[PDB]
């Protein structure tokens, strides 16, 4: 190299409405030529003190690099801080105009946006995922230096730096601040270890919000534990439990063998399958209709329906909605989980599959699956970027079966003995709670609203609640309520629970 790199301007990242999320800010990097510094030793303590370096340790560094023509002194100073060191007129001290990322929303979109390294290269999240679009191409400038390495002049701009391109994400910052605030509050209120909240636009496949606890400030790195950096909604796999019962119910209704008014005997609240024992949470029931199986969240009831229709029909619905399937988002470190398949399904595996014990999914996958159901059984491909021209979508559940299932889920929320904490002020909502044993628990709520013209699907995951309450309908459902209520207002969704 007789040339020095011209860092290009990194692409602006914004939310869906142009709110900046990642801003390339001008910084100044100082470098020095030790062969020039070696003839100006009486200036070193002044230069050391301006750099925040120890006098002797700085002098040692120069003396050791004496034959080298380039050393970095300090990186990423404000243009003002850098201009101050240049003003000392220390022979052989030079500056390079660089760029450093600033994240205006900080810890609020840390996991989605990600961050760049010291070299301004995308290391996590969107920054990495879209690195090629955002980076552009670094320029080149030919220099003239005497034999001592002293930079005389810039000969030419060999290759002009081409700046990065802007990126508008699908994230609505208002919804993102709202989900972030409320998930933080739920974590603190319950003494919970971690959590995730995902908001989906059921019509466009857009991820409107994706927040996780714990989080970190991407602007102030240093000391950061791995727990805080984990983009949980995409990288944490979990058993979805009772939240998959709507999909087992879709298979039952699509079979031709079941209707909502159908009865299933669940007495005495247990069912033995060889050495394994299926157990219901509440065990004071005998005959339950299909809606009552979802309200009471009966594992016995769903297991018996699964035996009637066969696991192959259930697996097919769960596979089609995307449970344990690749999202198609080339998102760094995103997990696929697992949807177990069998050549021939045994009795025990049929039952555990129908109630979500036999499977691992992400909160993104669960939200996408509820979006398909909410969107009249049609699955629109997921997007982390703003969707202007919406792709076609795949019909994964018949519209009639999807409509019936939506109605039962509105009853789960609105009916006697139902998930009353998930109710949305002034709207009809629909959803299903889940509680998974990890005793350590995972508290879930999945749902959508308005129930009469769905617009939003949402998943709330609260990992390890440490207070008396651990059930999803008690821990996660009130989060869904507050966030959904706020999001429908922000999106000008007309209330459908009109007096
Ligand atoms: C569905 O989420 C249903 N969950 C279960 O039956 C599971 N365990 O239940 C509890 C937490 C009571 C237990 O300690 O046994 C379960 C499913 S997958 C898994 N790994 N554990 C709960 C009962 N329904 S909800 O609607 O009340 O949340």
Atom of ligand 1 nearest to the CA of 438: 20
Ligand 1, atom 25, residue with closest C-alpha: 434
Atom of ligand 1 nearest to the CA of 243: 2
Is ligand 1 within 6 A of the CB of residue 471? yes
CATH architecture of 171-217+413-499: 2-Layer Sandwich (3.30)
Q: According to the 3-state scheme, what is the secondary structure of the chain? A: CCEEEECCCCCCEECCCCCEEEEEEEEEEEEECHHHHCCCHHHHHHHHHHHCCCHHHHHHHHHHCCCCCCEEEEEEECHHHHHHHHCCCCCCEEEEEEEEEECCCHHHCHHHHCCECCCCCECCHHHHHCHHHHHCECEEEEEEECCCCCEEEEEEEEECCECCCCEEECCCHHHHHHHHHHHHHHHHHHCCCEEEEEEEECCCCEEEEEEEECCCCCCCCCCCCHHHHCCHHHHCCECCHHHHHHHHHHHHHHHCCCCCCCEEECCCCEEEECCEEEECCCCCCCEEEHHHHHHCCCHHHHHHHHHHHCHHHHHHHHHHHCCCCCCCCCCCCCCCCECCCCCCCCHHHHHHHHCCCCCEECHHHHHHHHHHHHCCCEECCCECECCCCCCCCEECCCHHHHHHHHHHHHHHHHCCCCCHHHCCCCCCCEEEEEEEECCCEEEEEEEEECCCCCCEEEEEEEECCCCCCCCHHHHCHHHHHHHHHHHHHHCCCCCCCCC
Q: Which residue has the tokens 């994400």?
A: 169
Experimental method: X-ray
- Judge whether 285 counts as a catalytic residue: no
In angstroms, how far apart are the furthest CA atoms of the chain?
95
Q: Which residue has the tokens 């796999």?
A: 237
CATH superfamily of domain region 231-412: DD-peptidase/beta-lactamase superfamily (3.40.710.10)
Q: How far apart are CA 30 and CA 73, in angstroms?
A: 5
Domain boundaries, the chain: 1-170, 171-217+413-499, 231-412
Which of 385, 391, 389 has its CA nearest to residue 167?
385
Q: How far apart are CA 278 and CA 271, in angstroms?
A: 5
CA angle 205, 250, 329 (to 5 degrees): 25
Is ligand 1 within 6 A of the CB of residue 297? yes
Task: Give 275: exposed, middle or buried? Use CB within 10 Å, 0-12, 13-18, 19+.
Answer: exposed
Q: How far apart are CA 122 and CA 274, in angstroms?
A: 53
Is ligand 1 within 6 A of the CB of residue 349? no
Testing ligand 1's pocket by substitution, the residue of 239, 248, 269, 281 carrying the most ligand atoms inside 8 A of its CB is 281
State the catalytic residue, choosing from 24, 170, 242, 476.
Answer: 242
Q: Could you tell me which residues come within 8 angstroms of residue 284 by beta carbon, excluding any fewer than 6 positions away?
A: 269
Is ligand 1 within 6 A of the CB of residue 435? yes
Is ligand 1 within 6 A of the CB of residue 437? yes
Is residue 170 within 8 A of residue 209, CB to CB? The reply is no
Q: Which residue has the tokens 């534990």?
A: 225
Q: How far apart are CA 255 and CA 178, in angstroms?
A: 41
Q: Which residue has the tokens 């989980």?
A: 337
Ligand 1, atom 19, residue with closest C-alpha: 436
Atom of ligand 1 nearest to the CA of 433: 26
Ligand 1 center–CA 460 separation, angstroms: 16
User: Token pair of 117, please?
Assistant: 């390294």
- Fold agreement (171-217+413-499, 231-412): no
Is ligand 1 within 6 A of the CB of residue 242? yes
Is ligand 1 within 6 A of the CB of residue 303? no
């Amino acid at each position: 190299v007789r040339h020095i790199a011209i860092p290009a301007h990194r692409g602006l990242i914004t939310d869906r409405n142009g709110e900046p999320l990642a801003v390339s800010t001008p910084v100044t990097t100082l470098w020095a030529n030790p062969k020039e510094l070696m003839t100006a030793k009486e200036r070193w303590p002044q230069l050391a003190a301006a750099l925040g370096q120890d006098t002797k340790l700085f002098a040692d560094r120069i003396e050791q690099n004496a034959e080298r023509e380039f050393i970095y002194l300090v990186r990423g100073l404000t243009p003002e801080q850098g201009e101050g060191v240049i003003a000392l007129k220390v022979p052989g001290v030079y500056s390079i105009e660089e760029f450093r990322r600033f994240y205006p929303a900080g810890e609020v979109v840390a996991h989605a946006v990600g961050f760049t390294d010291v070299d301004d290269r995308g290391r996590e999240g969107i920054e990495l995922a879209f690195d090629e679009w955002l980076a552009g191409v670094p320029g080149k400038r030919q220099v003239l230096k005497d034999r001592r390495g002293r930079v005389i002049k810039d000969v030419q701009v060999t290759k002009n730096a081409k700046p990065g391109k802007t990126l508008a994400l699908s994230i609505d910052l208002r919804l993102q601040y709202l989900a972030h605030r409320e998930l933080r509050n739920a974590l603190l209120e319950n003494g919970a270890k971690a959590g995730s909240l995902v908001i989906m636009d059921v019509k466009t496949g857009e991820i409107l919000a994706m927040t996780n606890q714990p989080t970190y400030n991407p602007n102030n790195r240093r000391n950061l534990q791995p727990a805080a950096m984990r983009n949980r909604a995409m990288i944490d796999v979990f058993e979805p439990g009772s939240t998959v019962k709507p999909f087992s119910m879709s298979a039952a209704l699509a079979s031709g063998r079941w209707k909502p008014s159908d009865i299933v005997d669940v007495y005495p609240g247990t069912l033995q399958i060889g050495r394994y024992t299926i157990r219901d949470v509440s065990r004071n029931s005998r005959q339950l209709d299909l809606t009552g199986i979802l309200i009471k969240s009966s594992n016995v009831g769903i297991s018996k329906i699964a035996f009637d229709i066969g696991a192959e029909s259930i697996y097919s619905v769960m596979q089609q909605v995307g449970l344990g399937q690749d999202t198609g988002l080339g998102f760094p470190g995103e997990r696929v989980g697992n949807l177990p398949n069998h050549r021939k399904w045994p009795k025990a595996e049929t039952a555990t599959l129908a109630y979500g014990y036999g499977l691992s999914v992400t909160a993104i996958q669960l939200a996408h699956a509820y979006a398909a159901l909410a969107n009249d059984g049609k699955s629109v491909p997921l997007s982390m970027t703003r969707v202007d021209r919406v792709p076609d979508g795949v019909q994964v559940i018949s519209p009639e079966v999807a409509s019936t299932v939506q109605g039962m889920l509105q009853q789960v929320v609105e009916a006697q003995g139902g998930v009353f904490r998930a109710q949305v002020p002034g709207y009809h909502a629909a959803g299903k709670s889940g509680t998974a044993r990890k005793n350590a628990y995972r508290s879930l709520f999945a749902g959508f609203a308005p129930a009469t013209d769905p617009r939003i699907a949402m998943v709330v995951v609260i990992d390890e609640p440490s207070k008396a309450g651990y059930f999803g309908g008690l821990v996660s459902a009130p989060v869904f309520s507050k966030v959904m209520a706020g999001a429908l207002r922000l999106m000008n969704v007309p209330p459908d629970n009109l007096p």
